[model samples]
Target chain A: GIDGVVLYEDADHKFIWLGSQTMQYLIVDRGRGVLLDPGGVHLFSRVVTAISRFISVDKIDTIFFSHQDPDVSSGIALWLGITKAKIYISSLWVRFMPHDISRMVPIPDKGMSISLPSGSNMKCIPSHFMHSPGQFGLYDERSRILFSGDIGAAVFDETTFVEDFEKHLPLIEGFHVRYMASNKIVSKWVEYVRRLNPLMIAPQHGAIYKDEQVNNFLNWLSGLKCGTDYIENLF
Target chain B: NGIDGVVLYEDADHKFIWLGSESVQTMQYLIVDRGRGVLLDPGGVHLFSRVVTAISRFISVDKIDTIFFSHQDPDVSSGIALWLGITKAKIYISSLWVRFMPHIVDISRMVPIPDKGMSISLPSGSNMKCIPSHFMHSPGQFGLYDERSRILFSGDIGAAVFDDDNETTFVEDFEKHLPLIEGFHVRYMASNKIVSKWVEYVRRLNPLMIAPQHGAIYKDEQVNNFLNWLSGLKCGTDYIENLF
Candidate 1:
């Protein structure tokens, strides 16, 4: 049995969760896979080993770095050695990557489509300065899930699917105000996600939002003041 | 004053002026075609006087048709407000930079070149290309290719520092110039893969000359030599192991 949770499944594609606090997703389409946020070196063994029950490591041919934080992309060198993947990250962070950057493709500020062997394309949505200046959110069409890198991420520990809106907002609120660049960018990102209208919003940490909670989360984020907007509060 | 009118490439219809070579660090370019003036990488506020003075020899400062920024560095973009005031030209920078434009000169005259790039039309009905060179040094970056002249204005790809006293504008012996370029490339360029990709793209264009932003120009067999050297070269994370 696969140790990872099956967030969504169908005959041809599946989204398998492969991480705890720092989330990673293995998106298998047909027989091939795309790995999202292949985290730090320490979790490499566990993630690689856990996902092997469903899809082989080499089968993960597309590696995505939503942004180039150590938590998300520091283990890129290890992934490059093992997979025949075409790695993608924001163009802004490619120069700062300590790994073999040649293996990586720069995703422009506008983002792009990550085409899979299955003929369906995953959307690489731009979410700049949400946390990182080069942030991106990946959308899996079949599952109707938007793999939001950090926008809705919480500092709290327990792994739970967000069902109650009022209770979940408090756990995730502080990170948005402190880490995000500003609400100007967050609202812009919110507008993009609203148009996509994803059925689920999966963050890299804390919890995942599904059904009505997705809109609830987006509504709150679009209106809130954070980062530079609350620049005086941090002082 | 003698350096002001150095025409790098000129034909019956199009002219490429290599301006500000005397300044050494951030050289600028002017492509005169169909009686219209297009400026490329028009240096910083530091090079303002030299840039306009050199450009004055070829085209009127106020009549510039277009301005293309290779990237968003201060050297490449800090003098943008001044240029906007001087010329009625529309500014073309990589779309990745459009978002950050408000912090600098604002985006009123800005034209964001898409990730795939586009062909720009000169008044003579000739076309020039703004090609992708992202992560060449900046996240949002581009290089210009003159379809008519076959010259590739490589932004920072082959940027080199010269001996301040060296009067040579064009690189005759590329091998001799390798040392001047190596240190910067090793640290600034992304890696061998992206470099090789860029080399492959440029080879197809079969560029008559390779003009870098901050260095001497490359032409003749040296285009191949520079491409061949860069195709196999190791830089960026290729040297990262030593740094850590």
Candidate 2:
């Protein structure tokens, strides 16, 4: 089944001892599976092994780096060797590339369309210098789902995977200061995402938030102090 | 002395003057003999435009002959890429540093500098000597001594932070101001005996003035003051007496 689809939504992504503790995104887009952010190099093999039951892991076409941070791109080097897929990243991402990896194709500005052969399409939006430089957003137009890089993110409890916005405000707010403080460029992102107006926002961390959740999240961010001052004052 | 050429100091958070900017410390050498020119270490690419302006005081900045690095560090070598836009100077570096150096810098036009104890006579009749000073910090670090001025450019070993406005242009002022030189020195260079051996070898070259990669230049008594300080600094079991 070249055009098969399955969504493994976790209530709680695994907890990592080092780096960021968050959920891993395992997106199976037909026979050509796309793993958004595989937590880190350690979690990558498990996701691939799970996906291999249905399809050959070698056939996966792209392992997108939402950004070049270790958490996002840790497993990319390993996947690149086996799958031999073209590394799709933003044009600006070349600045951060490890000065080693070769064969990279820039995903065009605004967004790119990946055909699933199910007569449906998956579009990747360039998240652009948002939280981190060279971030991205992947939107499925048909399903009205947006796989955001780190927008509307929250820390999930090891016991709970699905998020209730009301109960998670403090956790989300805390995570925002830690992760999203440098994301002052989100205003530009606002204009970009408004055009898409995604129905469900599935980010690299926490549970997928609905439209109302996204609205409340944006409202919270609008009032949040958008600067590095949080850590600057501490130091 | 008439303006021989421009010596531009790249302003990091704490420069030779104040604690340079939060960035990194850097300096550039714009050597001009009549009209011929050479440029060295223009800081980072962000400051390339100003570096060009600095070099133009002597010769057309576009006619730079070489872009050389004191050693491999982002603060010192990042600007080599920016300078490439103006002139086709051969990137000069130590031959022994071919592999470890330039981790981030582009080396398309790299020209390896000679090994330690090697000498090259520049066109200006002034010979450039590469005297080995191993185990100091960097692997292939060498002091570039100008035979004409007897000035020994001692890389990072004699580094000191000082105010730019201070007219004190001697090594004594640096020791009085800065705490300790950057990078590994007494611990990493060698036993006191080997260090004394290096000092004696450097003495044979007869350097009258000492200029380093990060601090003010030393002259006359300042030179002796620096050698004495280097002596006091413990190196393994042997003390400064090993040099004498």
Candidate 3:
């Protein structure tokens, strides 16, 4: 029984949060919508059920996969079968995508901007090698919301959104250190996001980062060393 | 003296002098001297003596007409106060960091580079283009392009840190240079979009040489090779995944 939570809503835009720990998002403008990281086949029905409450499955014109990760794109074929949506992914891993969906749009390394039927648009920010060599993050300019893929993703039991980022540090720290490449990569990611000045950061996992929490996460990520920082010999 | 394939410096007429510690290879560059000189990324105050001595061998420090900084990193421009104390040259940096850089050097000498970048007519009749390379590790970063020489002083965009044994004046073999730089590029560069945009723009310019603040410079075929490689690379948010 997966439920979709409304992360943000205004006169023109609606961002519906879906999935649990390994999450997905349905971003709506007017009636047109784009499903971001629809998760694996197992979550397909639940995601569809949740998304159906707001907009019909046919209204989803695009399905975006941040990378080739199973959690991010494995259920892509299933979604393609259910809806007429075209898939979007980084060109680096286009051949590796499963189920051979004919409508896949391989985004160039420079990224691309897609305008929805509702007049608003989403910019795919090329974020390569933060964890995966061929990943990207989506930014909705109108809402100022950045779907950061796995950059801010944290592993935790809490299924709800993050309210206190400082308190939530423990839940995210271990995951970032293990999954993220290094402080250098994290700092660069932080710098790019800071320039965009996103109103909210929605990762594929754990909780959402808003307002001061966004800066708090960026500052913490900028300094914290990961990947190579872990000395295996010490353990 | 007129510049030729002169080999005025160790590797080439215009070359980069390595500075800072072995682990962190900060660089200072001396472009071709048509009797008037240009210095790029002058490095920190500690390397002032070493850099001056190196530059003196080819051209006097007074002939330095301009000092270009790609950004305001301590390693990139902290030596500004020291350089200003001696030389009468103006320092050019991105306008975004113009106010912030006064803390490092006098405000009077600071020339702000606009977003689209500006071309400065040098005393030697050569023009240097200050190209905007914003959000490439720094929010207010810029790269310099020497039109006469066709060399792009690409700040940290193509920067890499190398150990003693592998370090050299210029990249001999790019495949061999990959290990030393791949990690650094993935970590230091902000995102693929910015890198791609920079690469695409620089590719059109068709530079004869590509010099960075750290590591070896790329010349001839290596320049295009590097551009292609950089365009395809994925960094930052691309690395995150489910480790388990």
Backbone clash total for model 3 is: 15
Rank by DockQ, highest first.
Answer: 3, 1, 2
What is the lDDT of every predicted structure here? 0.74, 0.52, 0.70
Quote the RMSD, in angstroms, for model 1. Answer: 17.9
Which parts of model 1 are misplaced by more than 4 Å?
Answer: A1-235, B1-3, B21-26, B76-78, B162-165
Please give the ranking of all candidate structures by lDDT, highest first, separated by commas: 1, 3, 2
Q: What is the lDDT of residue B14 in candidate 3?
A: 42
The digit string of per-residue lDDT tens for model 2 on B134-211 reads: 434333356666665566777666764332333344445645644545223543343343345566677677788777
Q: Against the true structure, what is every candidate's RMSD?
A: 17.9, 20.0, 19.7
Find the 10 residues in a row with the least total lDDT in model 2 chain B. Answer: B13-22
Error of 2 at B14 (Å): 16
Model 3 per-residue lDDT tens digits across residues B65-173: 7888887653423356678777888888876566545324467788888667889885556677887775565545788887767778888777764433444557888
Candidate 2 stretches with Cα past 4 Å from truth are: A1-23, A71-74, A95-102, A155-163, A181-184, A228-235, B1-244
Stretches of candidate 3 off by over 4 Å are A19-22, A71-74, A98-101, A157-159, A231-235, B1-244
- Residue B102 CA error for candidate 2 (Å)? 28
Candidate 1 lDDT by residue in tens digits, A82-133: 8989889887666545325667888876788988777778989887656554
| Sliding window of 10 residues with minimal summed lDDT for model 2 chain A | A11-20
